[PDB]
């Protein structure tokens, strides 16, 4: 029994070409380069999914020391004062949302600063 | 000797090259002594008048 490739190959090809649809030039329309661009695409995907936490952690911290210094403390001293009172265990992201609500942030700043004295 | 081009030239850069091949439409203008159109500083092809009739046909 013969069994030519036929419909199989072209199914696979169209799948790849359909993953690759934002892409520039023949990264979008030829298979070979489509599949090749997707190789590095997989690398970059799997990297960023756990690096994105690094970036967002940066953005949280970076937003926290801004209000810290806005009041005349700073990130290192302010989280050391929110740690020196045991009871503050909220994530930095929630300290950011508080940095978007100045009154509560200042309440935590005076709380923290009443713990390094 | 024998220079050759290196990498095949892409669709897009090719089109930027051809960006200048746009044709220039003739500035046609209608014959005062006839119906049809005529090129400026030429005789009307249809009538043959450059002021009287100039060409035969």
């Amino acid at each position: 029994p013969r069994a030519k490739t036929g419909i199989v190959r072209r199914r696979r090809h169209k799948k790849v070409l359909k993953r690759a649809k934002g892409f520039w030039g023949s990264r979008s329309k030829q298979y070979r380069n489509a599949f090749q661009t997707l190789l590095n695409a997989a690398t970059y995907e799997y990297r960023d999914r756990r690096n994105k936490k690094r970036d967002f952690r940066r953005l949280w911290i970076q937003r926290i020391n801004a209000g810290a210094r806005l009041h005349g403390m700073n990130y290192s001293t302010f989280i050391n004062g929110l740690k020196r009172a045991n009871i503050d265990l909220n994530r930095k992201v929630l300290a950011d949302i508080a940095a978007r609500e100045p009154e509560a942030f200042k309440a935590l700043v005076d709380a923290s600063r009443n713990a390094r004295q | 000797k024998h220079p050759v081009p290196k990498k095949k030239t892409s669709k897009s850069k090719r089109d930027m090259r051809r960006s200048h091949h746009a044709l220039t439409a003739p500035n046609l203008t209608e014959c005062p002594q006839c119906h049809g159109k005529k090129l400026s500083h030429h005789i009307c092809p249809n009538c043959g008048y450059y002021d009287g009739r100039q060409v035969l046909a």
Binding site: - | L23, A25, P26, L28, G36, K37
Partner: protein
């Protein structure tokens, strides 16, 4: 306002192509032909009649004749009013290609592409707007 199946729609609605003309297999490079076909496009079908007639290219002949057929079937077949007609559409796609051998130096041959042209134009009433 629609039928049962495509088998019925094929019988009852026969689908016409108003304003349409196409000139197939024109022995010319399309690449050359579009150069004028762009000039015509979107313009009053009389300006197309005049433009096409002074632009100085061999390719202007076939693109002339088609334009008439567009207007012809715009008027004989489609009841359209010729003081409305205009070039709503114009484009050329490539037809087949005659390939020929051509000898070159030191005994090599090459292959040479005599491209054909499918010019096509679709006039319509300037009743749009």
């Amino acid at each position: 306002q629609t039928f049962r199946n495509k088998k019925q729609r094929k019988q009852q609605v026969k689908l016409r192509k108003p304003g349409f003309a196409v000139a197939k297999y024109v022995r010319m490079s399309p690449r050359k032909v579009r150069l004028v076909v762009d000039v015509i496009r979107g313009k009053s079908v009389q300006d197309a009649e005049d433009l096409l007639r002074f632009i100085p290219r061999s390719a202007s002949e076939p693109v002339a004749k088609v334009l008439n057929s567009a207007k012809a079937n715009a008027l004989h077949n489609d009841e359209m009013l010729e003081d409305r007609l205009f070039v709503k559409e114009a484009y050329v796609d490539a037809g087949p290609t005659l390939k020929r051998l051509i000898p070159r130096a030191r005994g090599s041959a090459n292959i040479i592409k005599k491209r054909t042209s499918h010019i096509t134009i679709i006039v319509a009433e300037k009743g749009n707007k």
